Subunit: 255 residues, 4 copies
Amino acid sequence: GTRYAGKVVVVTGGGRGIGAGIVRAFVNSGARVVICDKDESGGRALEQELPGAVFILCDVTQEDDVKTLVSETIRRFGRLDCVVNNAGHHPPPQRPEETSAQGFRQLLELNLLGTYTLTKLALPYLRKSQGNVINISSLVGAIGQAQAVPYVATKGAVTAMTKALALDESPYGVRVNCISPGNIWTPLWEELAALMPDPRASIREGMLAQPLGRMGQPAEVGAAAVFLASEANFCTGIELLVTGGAELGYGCKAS
Amino acid sequence: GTRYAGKVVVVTGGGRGIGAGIVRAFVNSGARVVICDKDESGGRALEQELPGAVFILCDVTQEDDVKTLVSETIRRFGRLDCVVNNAGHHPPPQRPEETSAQGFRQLLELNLLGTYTLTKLALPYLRKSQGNVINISSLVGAIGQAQAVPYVATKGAVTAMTKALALDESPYGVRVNCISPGNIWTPLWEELAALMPDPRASIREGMLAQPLGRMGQPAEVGAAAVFLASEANFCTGIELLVTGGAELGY
Amino acid sequence: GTRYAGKVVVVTGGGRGIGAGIVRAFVNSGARVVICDKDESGGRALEQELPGAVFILCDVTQEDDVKTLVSETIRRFGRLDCVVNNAGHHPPPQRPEETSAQGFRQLLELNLLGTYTLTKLALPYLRKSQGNVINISSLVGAIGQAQAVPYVATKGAVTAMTKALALDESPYGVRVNCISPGNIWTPLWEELAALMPDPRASIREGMLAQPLGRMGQPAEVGAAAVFLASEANFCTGIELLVTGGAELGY
Amino acid sequence: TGTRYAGKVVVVTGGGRGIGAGIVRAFVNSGARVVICDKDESGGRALEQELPGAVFILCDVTQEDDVKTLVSETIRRFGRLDCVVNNAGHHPPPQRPEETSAQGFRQLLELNLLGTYTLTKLALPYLRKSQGNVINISSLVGAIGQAQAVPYVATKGAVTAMTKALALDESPYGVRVNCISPGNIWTPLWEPRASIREGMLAQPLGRMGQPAEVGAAAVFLASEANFCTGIELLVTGGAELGYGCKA
């Protein structure tokens, strides 16, 4: 309740799954948390549950929404210490032939340009506070993934952008890092699995993709974020892997 | 003269600079090369010089241009073995505050979605030839650079996409690789350098920015591409660094 | 206070510098800490200041010292939750011609095989507690460094070995990770700087060697270690960089 | 024979079979003079009989006098040294960490790490004169790990890292130093049926690699990668890519 006391944190896509885990972690650290999500229901239930938290309806692809989010934050709490860019969408599995450019553009809006926009607008305030930026990328940005060309591209862009921005903002004492989760068990993961012919088999396959033999927890991503914000003071431009070793060793990559 | 003989290669952004180095390299391998660019002046001059090269006017951001290019390449040469996605722009230095989302979107159109569009359209024919894709990314995608957030983002996206696609295309035996150059000398570079407050100083900085103590040549990028196309048959989803050691502890 | 309470931690090379920063960080977590080192003078001082810390004289290159350490730790504290392998020496700068195989072997003995031996002997106990291993590597292992071939090689080995071990230990739920520090300030560094031809310039050079514009602190490495031990439950075989951005396009 | 590396002199350690033999052939086909360096007489002697562009010198890279002689003999016979390919190395059988020993680990560092160090050290004066290059054969498992191979993995992480440090040291002299990191390469070493299959399917390409493919990569690094130093060239069939079966 004291590790990030007196700090103000914005978590986008914060209403459920990974975002919610991050939100909870930060609230437990004693931080004030602004839950930013386009979905009313999720973030509003979460704001009721957690007094350390406040829900602001916001679509990060809409610049005015982002502009308002930032102004509201400063207006209500007078400072901004951490921006966690977690807003993002994993599409269902799609072969490259069955992707479109329009779909790819849309996914870049959702996964990359929202991050860009909030970060740009937040940065003046993060300089004043010597705050920090945490982007939620994905392991698949680094190693790839089958049937996810657009998604993988968007997350490689996020991880790369993180490094560029780290370099630009280091003169101002603003650290910029990313977390790259692997397979994290969320309702999202579950809806996707439900689309498969044998969803149970697909969930198993997902568990066994980690040497640890399980998938990760939103709380575990949340812990990593609180660490990056509150104690990783000589870390900038790093990619913190929360994957259960899924990138390690030989596996089953063909059939 | 023999290494990639009887093969058909499309090089986007092939009209000059790095792209021209790649075209030349493939021509010297014996390949038929389609220079695909909006730079006609470069492209037609290369085509006039190199009998093995032909120029087709094409903007990769324009889907119908790219459909026509692929269709013409097949109609004319009957096959497609290799696509080199080299089209792309490095903007001037820009601090993050002085970037715009619009500018960023435009750069994604050129550097990322152009690569996507052509690869997508070429892939049915690459499968038939068991061909390969070579995307020209950049070291800065991997390690960052100052004053280049959009650019770095676009190249990190191309490198990542390379890997995704390698995975998807592996069952068809189509390999998908990228080359990430560092500081490569071009006639444009040389011309810009001469406008500097101190050109000699600027040139030295550029040469000493990697352990090898010089800048790269377009031919060196080309050689790397020819290797990937012609002899790297167990390589897929790799990022081949052509940087002079720039990323090393230096 | 509370977040690694009830747990038993062995820190090798814990008597001073980076090691002492890790010890203190764990002590402040509420853990019982066994300082394992050949540096008695540092180790006994730390033990006297920190009630949660205890010193056991142990050379990790000596297998029987290590067997004794582990056995004493168990017999005294009944458990072992975390092993931090921080023992290791960075030699002064040496050109490759000026290294010897014998030197290299000795440095492997300390930096690599010491880590191996302790981890091997602890693992049966770590399995029982579902504990974890934290090896302190170095950024230079990842990107290289001039005039440090043996040292770079040993750290590359430690980081690789971390991944190997993470795989092997994963079925038992034992996590194995590494922290790769860049330039971290220590009293020894400060004392060496003072001997330089120009200490001010030397100090500046060290501070400006990473984008954050200062050197790291032992405490920061300790914080990272406590995070890995206590809260990184889905992290295994990772390399956590504590470098201030040193490896970036900088 | 070939023109790409014509007039050049190349030393390939562990060159008598498997991957080393593929590297030797690739270089002989590039028009290079190749010194096959191996501790095994039979393999390298058969290969030198087969390939006129090639010469067999019996040598154990863990023995410094053998290495000293190898280098001196190369220079005495051919007057120059352009490329050293450090491919000598051993993969032990699969071993749980508890069943490894320190002594075993030290032995493997001699075989996989210190031999490379020693030859490279002795060769470097000549490599400077020729503006030659060094190519170390590491392994993918150095980078991503492997199960039941702690010592081996450590040795290869060491090789890859050393490559980078040396690249930095030798760049002022124009000597490039790169490594190749092979994944699963089909050799008689590699060579149950179920395990072979599992090895094939560890690559998205659905097959294992061939020594010739590692050879091609070496010839490229030697002869045309002139702005490459300190790189890790992956010849792995995409094994490091994507999700797999890791439990």
